[PDB]
Amino acid sequence: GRDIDDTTDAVRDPQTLEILDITPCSFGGVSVITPGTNTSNQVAVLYQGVNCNVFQTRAGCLIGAEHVNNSYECDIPIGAGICASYQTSQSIIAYTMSLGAENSVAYSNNSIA
Amino acid sequence: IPINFTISVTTEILPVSMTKTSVDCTMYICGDSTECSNLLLQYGSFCTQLNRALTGIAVEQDKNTQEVFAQVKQIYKTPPIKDFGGFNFSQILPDPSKPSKRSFIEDLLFNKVTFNGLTVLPPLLTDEMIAQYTSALLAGTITSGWTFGAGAALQIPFAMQMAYRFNGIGVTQNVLYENQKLIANQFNSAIGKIQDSLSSLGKLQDVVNQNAQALNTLVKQLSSNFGAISSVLNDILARLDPPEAEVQIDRLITGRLQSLQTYVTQQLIRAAEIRASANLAATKMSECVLGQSKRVDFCGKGYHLMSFPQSAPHGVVFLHVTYVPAQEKNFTTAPAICHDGKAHFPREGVFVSNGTHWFVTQRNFYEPQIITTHNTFVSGNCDVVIGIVNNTVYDPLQPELD
Amino acid sequence: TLVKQLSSNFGAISSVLNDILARLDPPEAEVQIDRLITGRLQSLQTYVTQQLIRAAEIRASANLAATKMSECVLGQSKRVDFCGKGYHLMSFPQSAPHGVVFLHVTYVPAQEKNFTTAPAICHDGKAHFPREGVFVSNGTHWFVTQRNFYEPQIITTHNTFVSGNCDVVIGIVNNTVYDPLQPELD
Ligand SMILES: *[C@@H]1O[C@H](CO)[C@@H](O[C@@H]2O[C@H](CO)[C@@H](O)[C@H](O)[C@H]2NC(C)=O)[C@H](O)[C@H]1NC(C)=O
Ligand SMILES: *[C@@H]1O[C@H](CO)[C@@H](O)[C@H](O)[C@H]1NC(C)=O
Ligand SMILES: *[C@@H]1O[C@H](CO)[C@@H](O)[C@H](O)[C@H]1NC(C)=O
Ligand SMILES: *[C@@H]1O[C@H](CO)[C@@H](O)[C@H](O)[C@H]1NC(C)=O
Ligand SMILES: *[C@@H]1O[C@H](CO)[C@@H](O)[C@H](O)[C@H]1NC(C)=O
Ligand SMILES: *[C@@H]1O[C@H](CO)[C@@H](O)[C@H](O)[C@H]1NC(C)=O
Ligand SMILES: *[C@@H]1O[C@H](CO)[C@@H](O)[C@H](O)[C@H]1NC(C)=O
Ligand SMILES: *[C@@H]1O[C@H](CO)[C@@H](O)[C@H](O)[C@H]1NC(C)=O
Ligand SMILES: *[C@@H]1O[C@H](CO)[C@@H](O)[C@H](O)[C@H]1NC(C)=O
Ligand SMILES: *[C@@H]1O[C@H](CO)[C@@H](O)[C@H](O)[C@H]1NC(C)=O
């Protein structure tokens, strides 16, 4: 059984005559997040694509970091719209970045500034 | 001199970034053969250099996407009312119905486009945030005119802004105010025409095609023996001892290294081209969307009035709005006018001929007026100009002098 | 990286050529020698390619710098957001090691004020449009002012020109345009 990349993708077990699937398990690069050794030493580790305070991210599994529900402009980009920072003792937090504030404009058909 | 004027719109496609990639060196060249790694430890710097180059390309891609879009640090918001002087802005504004704020034309545009150490990284700015930026830009360029590109955002009614720009391209305001319904109808019809036209993008797809071809050629290159006895390292090691198999092993190693070198060079060149395109896109975004452009044939063919950015998968799409002349009319003219032995030149315009009378009119739209002293200024006598016509300039003060 | 690459044996028996030649005869040492030669050639090829690409990028940056120098320092630029954020007034080049540094000078607006406005003005059944500016509302009176800095003036015939009647404009306000000639007509 092959694919577009003409590499093995399936196989039939030759005793029970049933279909089996295959998948490699060697993905993932290792990355680390540091708020700067100038201030403190606590760090968090980020894996690239594997599935895993173990918190889960669209771009890997994050360990050593604490999730929050807020949103700010972010300091250290990570991936898939997730950013880490240090403001909080104090620790390392992750969240979804905020593109900025939001102000409506009082646009009326006779008002000028 | 033209007598009628239409309003057209035109698209323009630009790539912004390609697919971020990464290729681990050892996992590709070797499999699980430990001795293969031992041999590669004679070539150590090569893998580090290749990985560094790929990381550089990835960060360059993200930098392009960052530069081209986030031109504003204050996300604006369209008012709930749609009172824009009859301009049916409904095909490019976000719709609350869909989960993402992707507008209709963005949604239509987004659908037309369709193992061994080849991890693919995702961009650190998801498409929803890109659509958010685009919507913010649309709100800013619709309500706040264009001053929001310089400091704060200043509110101003849309009709007055269109009058501003019509003044910009060299026609008086009254032309716009006298034809609001016609202009709005033409604009809406043009928007609908674009909506139809896009319902049936080579520059945005050949990038993906080339990336697929490059990766496919890199993968398929594994099959070849590179002049060795067989492809798989496991078969070679299991059938021969190291003292005679090392030649086959290192020949394969050289083959894989050559393939990686070639692919990396191709990626670097393509990335340089993409960066050039992204810088052009940023310049167009900052000189068309904000303000008005006097650079002829830059922001769409013909005279330029405004623009509307739109997002696209790995791309960006502009909707320029261009004033264009129409049916004209023959006329007779002469530069100077001689009244009392002294010349007369128009302040703004030319001297078209009725065939019986004379007039002064705007340079781009037929508007006959009466030649007064408030439209011309005098300099020198009538004895030096190469061409001139006898006539009389009416004066406003004389009838009031009663 | 180019220098440190010398250390590696490139799959040969040792690094230094002198040791190889002093320990083996040419008929058996030539393979080690030419393997090393291939290694050094590959390293030089890679470094040269990297240098060429970096030089192309630097040339692009230098051409952009020349364009900025000729369009910001000399004259004024209407290309928005080219010579510094905001409106542009002048520039001042400065040198730097292997670089160049500009000091743009940008006019930027400040605190604003709400107002009411209407495009046209109807005086005697005929329209009135400003020559330069807009019609801001005192809340009691009307004025014409510059487009970028509040300067109220009195609406005369020297600030507006007429075209057509009052029966076609989409929005308009009743008012009276003072005339300079009438008081002097005494
Ligand atoms: C190969 O031998 C195995 C031995 O277990 C066979 O497995 C049989 O599977 C059926 C399926 O329900 C059972 O009912 C039998 O009890 C199993 N054993 C035997 C001895 O039949 C298997 O079927 C054999 N392969 C083929 C192709 O028949
Ligand atoms: C960071 O480095 C500066 C360099 O002088 C030093 O003064 C400062 O104390 C350092 N930060 C901390 C938290 O010590
Ligand atoms: C990660 O993979 C495991 C493997 O089955 C799966 O159970 C899990 O749901 C995956 N994680 C997510 C977030 O889908
Ligand atoms: C301006 O908007 C107000 C909203 O209440 C409306 O009553 C008025 O008719 C509008 N005027 C014009 C000229 O559109
Ligand atoms: C100009 O063209 C439009 C449509 O093409 C038409 O309705 C109109 O009568 C023409 N003339 C003028 C003066 O607008
Ligand atoms: C805009 O056009 C769409 C269809 O083209 C229509 O459904 C909608 O009512 C229009 N809105 C306005 C304000 O004209
Ligand atoms: C000149 O213009 C007048 C109106 O101002 C018009 O009545 C007359 O026919 C014109 N002469 C021509 C067209 O020869
Ligand atoms: C214009 O008027 C002057 C005044 O007499 C006359 O001399 C001249 O010939 C006239 N122009 C032409 C073209 O005849
Ligand atoms: C209108 O302007 C005059 C000065 O020209 C001022 O005295 C008056 O208070 C203004 N009306 C207002 C602010 O309602
Ligand atoms: C402006 O004056 C005319 C003259 O009578 C009048 O008919 C018109 O109604 C006035 N405008 C408004 C908005 O009332």
Author numbering:
A (entry chain A): 566 to 617, 641 to 676, 689 to 713
B (entry chain B): 714 to 827, 855 to 940, 945 to 1146
C (entry chain A): 961 to 1146
Passage from the reporting paper:
The SARS-CoV-2 spike glycoprotein is the major surface antigen of the virus. Its function is to bind the host receptor ACE2 and mediate the subsequent membrane fusion required for cell entry. Here we have examined the structures and receptor-binding properties of spikes of the B.1.1.7 variant first described in Kent, United Kingdom (now termed Alpha)10,16–19 and the B.1.351 variant first described in South Africa (now termed Beta). Recently emerging variants of SARS-CoV-2 have acquired other substitutions in the spike including a number located at the monomer-monomer interfaces, at the receptor-binding site, and near the furin-cleavage site.
The spike from the Alpha variant is more stable against disruption upon binding ACE2 receptor than all other spikes studied. This feature is linked to the acquisition of a more basic substitution at the S1-S2 furin site (also observed for the variants of concern Delta, Kappa, and Omicron) which allows for near-complete cleavage. First, examination of the 2D class averages of ACE2-bound Alpha spike with its furin site intact reveals that all spikes in this dataset are present as trimers. This is the first cleaved SARS-CoV-2 spike protein in complex with ACE2 we have observed to remain fully trimeric upon receptor binding. A substantial proportion of all other spike/ACE2 complexes are dissociated into monomers. For example, in our previous study of the furin-cleaved spike of the original Wuhan strain (Wuhan) complexed with ACE2, we observed that more than 70% of the particles present were monomeric S1-S2/ACE2 complexes. We also observed that the Alpha variant spike is almost fully cleaved into S1 and S2, which was not observed for the Wuhan spike. This observation is consistent with one of the changes in the Alpha spike being the substitution P681H, which generates an even more basic furin-cleavage site (HRRAR). We have shown that the almost fully cleaved Alpha spike is more stable as a receptor-bound trimer than the Wuhan or Beta spikes which are subject to less efficient cleavage.
